[PDB]
């Protein structure tokens, strides 16, 4: 039992590393997108006054 939990908890750290890698790619895409979004909001408010 201990030697199949060891092979089960190895297969779930991979699955929690593959999921963490897809989330970090998804987070960096959202991080880049909210910096572009807040900046377009700032330039639009500035171009409406200038």
């Amino acid at each position: 039992e201990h030697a199949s939990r060891m092979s089960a908890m190895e297969n779930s750290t991979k699955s929690a590393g593959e999921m963490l890698g897809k989330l970090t790619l998804d987070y960096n895409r959202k991080r880049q997108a909210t910096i572009t979004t807040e900046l377009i909001e700032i330039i639009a408010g500035a171009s409406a006054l200038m």
């Binding site: 807040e38 909001e41 500035a46 409406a48 006054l49």
Partner: protein
């Protein structure tokens, strides 16, 4: 001699003055308007034109309407003659009790006191709320912030701080309602007639509170200046009458939101996430006046709304550097049923130094926070696995923290209609004695829900002894009570026949009402 309206765009009015423009921050009056419309000069636009924010609605303003300079800023009545009254942003009474008697009328704009007349004295303000006076204790004379998103309990906590601190103390109180619901401003008004804080009629001089109200329906020019109006009433009580004041401000967030609503119409290119470029210095000009000086003392309690439970947002994040005690309320504490939903870790006070509150209050507070922090580092592994590998050192600190978590909950005397419980005032010594019991294992045998919504540790023992009476009192009513009674559970149409059948009118009859409203007036 006077100016005229040149431009009306929303709440922002441009007034053109032929000769001798009014000063910035000065008050202007539009005559000919349907109501009293007060403008306040925000800037000089540069062609003999000032740009103003309106303290009321600009519906019905006309370009060319005569504007009278008053020669000073907005002046409101201050003194004992405002105790027991509700004021406007511009000092008008909105409680329909006549004109406001005024010792003096004061400009709502002044500078911060000085660096030389600051007070370096720390003494604890005991509130009765045991999560407050244990972990983040308030200072008598300092600025207190109540943070939290929508619906976590900022207004109930600020209501419980009114009747636990202001109901019996030496000086006066000022409630500044800044841009919140009108319904709860009426709830606060009627609660203070019944509590005797506000007395009406000829007993009005024995009042201990002044309400200044600028609630959500008011335009952004109004809600941006109510906090200055209520602070001016508190600054008269501190500077002139030299006495201790309590100043409660519900949502100081709405002061920053109101300035942000007019800001782009004042010609300012916007700052980060949507606020005005002058966000930190508009807020800083307000909070620097709410201080204990060498003349008197203003104990401020400010609710701060955090938008979408985000303490990262610039309007809550700027407020954090202005306070001496930041009670942070959390949704996750509220969703479990612990009320007041105070985050016990995120709440920080400056009275939590050992050379201020002593060592037997500091070590209990740092001990309670250590057990609650450890439990949150184990709750990552309990919610996955389920606390059968947790060492019985870690199992004991889960049971100790879960008792500590419920023992920070307390029934409030003002939440007696949400929770069906009479409220509990807990003294400071009984809070220190109780949590030192739960920390050192003096009460490890008591159940977990015996700590929930009680006063002190003597009422945990009066509740654990109660629940262990009343769970073994379950089986008296199982084998009987279905039948064979003294017939005060009587027959069917016996209970149907005392029903006083109310007459239904079976048509609305409003067109007879609508013609009747025509003949009246």
């Amino acid at each position: 001699d006077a100016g005229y309206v040149s431009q009306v765009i929303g709440p922002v009015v441009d007034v053109r003055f032929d000769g001798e423009l009014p000063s910035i921050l000065s008050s202007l009056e539009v005559e000919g308007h349907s109501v009293r419309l007060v403008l306040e000069v925000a800037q000089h636009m540069g062609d003999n034109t000032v740009r103003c924010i309106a303290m009321d609605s600009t519906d019905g303003l006309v370009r060319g309407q005569k504007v009278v300079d008053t020669g000073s800023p907005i002046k409101v009545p201050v003194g004992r003659g405002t105790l027991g009254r509700i004021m406007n942003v511009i000092g008008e009474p909105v409680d329909e009790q006549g004109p406001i008697d005024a010792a003096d009328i004061w400009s709502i704009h002044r500078e911060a006191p000085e660096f030389t007349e600051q007070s370096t004295e720390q003494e604890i303000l005991v509130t009765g709320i045991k999560v407050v006076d244990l972990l983040a204790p308030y200072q008598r004379g300092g600025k207190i912030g109540l943070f939290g998103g929508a619906g976590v309990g900022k207004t109930v906590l600020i209501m419980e701080l009114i009747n636990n601190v202001a109901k019996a103390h030496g000086g006066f109180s000022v409630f500044a309602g800044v841009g919140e619901r009108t319904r709860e401003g009426n709830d606060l008004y009627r609660e203070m007639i019944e509590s005797g804080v506000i007395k009406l009629g000829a007993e009005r001089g024995n009042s201990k509170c002044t309400l200044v109200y600028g609630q959500m329906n008011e335009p952004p020019g109004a809600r941006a200046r109510v906090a200055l109006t209520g602070l001016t009433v508190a600054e008269y009580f501190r500077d002139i009458e030299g006495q201790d004041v309590l100043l409660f401000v519900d949502n100081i967030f709405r002061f920053t939101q109101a300035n942000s609503e007019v800001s782009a119409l004042l010609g300012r290119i916007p700052s980060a996430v949507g606020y005005q470029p002058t966000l930190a210095t508009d807020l800083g000009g307000l909070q620097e006046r709410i201080t204990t000086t060498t003349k008197g003392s203003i104990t401020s309690v400010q609710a701060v709304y955090v938008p979408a439970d985000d303490l990262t947002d610039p309007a809550p994040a700027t407020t954090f550097a202005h306070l001496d005690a930041t009670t942070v309320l959390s949704r996750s504490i509220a969703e479990l049923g612990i009320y007041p939903a105070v985050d016990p870790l995120d709440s920080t006070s400056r009275m939590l130094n050992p050379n201020v509150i002593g060592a037997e209050h500091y070590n209990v507070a740092r001990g309670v926070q250590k057990v609650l922090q450890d439990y949150k580092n184990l709750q990552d592994i309990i919610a996955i696995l389920g606390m059968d590998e947790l060492s019985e050192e870690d199992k004991l600190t889960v049971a100790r923290a879960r008792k500590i978590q419920r023992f920070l909950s307390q029934p409030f005397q003002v939440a007696e209609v949400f929770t069906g419980t009479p409220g509990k005032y807990v003294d400071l010594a009984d809070t220190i004695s109780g949590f030192q019991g739960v920390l050192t294992g003096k009460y490890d045998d008591l159940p977990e829900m015996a700590f929930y919504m009680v006063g002190d540790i003597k009422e945990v023992k009066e509740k654990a002894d109660k629940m262990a009476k009343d769970i073994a009192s379950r089986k008296e009513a199982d084998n009987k009570k279905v039948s064979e009674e003294l017939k005060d559970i009587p027959s069917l149409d016996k209970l149907v026949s005392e029903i006083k059948e109310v007459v239904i009118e079976e048509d609305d009859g409003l067109e007879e009402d609508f013609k009747a409203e025509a003949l009246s007036s």
